[PDB]
Amino acid sequence: DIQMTQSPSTLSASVGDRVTITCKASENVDTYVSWYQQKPGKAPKLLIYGASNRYTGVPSRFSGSGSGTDFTLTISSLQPDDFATYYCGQSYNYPFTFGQGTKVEVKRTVAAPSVFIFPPSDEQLKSGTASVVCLLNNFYPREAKVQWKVDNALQSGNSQESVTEQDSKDSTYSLSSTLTLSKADYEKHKVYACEVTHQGLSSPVTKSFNRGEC
Amino acid sequence: QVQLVQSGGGVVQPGRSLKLSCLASGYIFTSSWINWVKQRPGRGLEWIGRIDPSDGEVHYNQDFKDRFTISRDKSKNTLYLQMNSLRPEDTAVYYCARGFLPWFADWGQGTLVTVSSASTKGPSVFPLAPSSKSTSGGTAALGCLVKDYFPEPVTVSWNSGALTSGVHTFPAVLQSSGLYSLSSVVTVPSSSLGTQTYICNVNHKPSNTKVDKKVEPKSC
DSSP states (O other): OOOEEEEOSEEEEOTTOOEEEEEEESSOOSSOEEEEEEOSSSOOOEEEETTTEEOTTOOTTEEEEEETTEEEEEESSOOSTTOSEEEEEEOSSSSOBOOOOEEEEEOOOOBOOOOEEEOOOTTTTTTTEEEEEEEEEEEBSSOEEEEEEETTEEOOSSEEEEEOOOOTTTOOEEEEEEEEEEHHHHTTOOEEEEEEEETTOSSOEEEEEESSOO | OOOOEEOOOOEEOTTSOEEEEEEOOHHHHTTSEEOEEEEOBTBOOEEEEEEOTTTOOEEEOHHHHTTEEEEOOTTTTEEEEEEOSOOGGGOEEEEOOEESTTOOOBOOOOEEEEEOOOOOBOOEEEEOOOOTTSOOOSOOOEEEEEEEEBSSOOOOEETTTTOOTTEEEOOOOOOTTSOEEEEEEEOOOTTHHHHSOOBEEEEETTTTEEEOOBOOOOOO
């Protein structure tokens, strides 16, 4: 009913910055928008209730403003704690809806990924399946692409990937991407290639091998 | 702090019903509204309903209206969430905030409900062995493919947790088959290979599986 929406989705920021998340109400509430801060593997906690009313213990850096359809949470100075995921959520009309969520991330310099393309172990091949792994390593920002090309035939819909969360030290992400298939087909092709694009790479990085050669 | 006490749910076969609890103190129970909020991992928050502190008037979401019922217990001072006819789409984390006005102030730690037909399986650990047919480069890349298991989670160490630097254990991915799979890689100086042994330490508590796969540097 009362669709609530946040922005930006993601937010590069570093200790000492003035961050600002923007919530939007498709409808009109008054001051019934609250802000929450849940970290990975944790329940959200209230920061600002009312529209500007800060909750107990919420440090004086978190500040709320706006009314009607345009709201905004503001952090006057970023701290180590403040790196988390923020939500907004109207409590004016039934039912109560929440914002998509805005993630704040520690900003650092652009770093391109170090690619590593792992060919199937001879024992998984016994299993009938053959998983070809592609590891993009210590890159920043997140935005990176992986393109599998078996026998120079760009593959699609035959792979999966999992990204790592901000490195506590490097502030760099790490991505794995597996090309999964049976062995009859793994045994039916020769060249497997992981073409990797990242905005920190001058050209796409291609890693490949040859089912058989060595 | 500011928390409540949830304690229900776990792994549950689809179509089958389930039920969570939300224990609250005598005053809290007869002094505020208890909202059950939902959150499917990787998505925002869905409000499921509420219940007035005096009588227990319940207010649901017309979606969950159809198959989720909120109740309580004066004698026990506990709220409830009956989840009948479960779908896989119900795999989420459930909270039970407590608060004034239309505010969700005091949130519970949340209970995870996992709907899956999948039986408990031990993982198959494969080597992500470093190619000798590769470039020197500088470092290398060790790894263990912990494939096909259920349910989460797994504890992946490297050399009994002696090697802890440059170790990226990726998030478990749910394959189409319904089984998870994740990788634990650790880049090391290509020269260190051969000289220093590298053995991952897979541990799956659910199926009581524990396997130590040593990974050998192999071009082929």
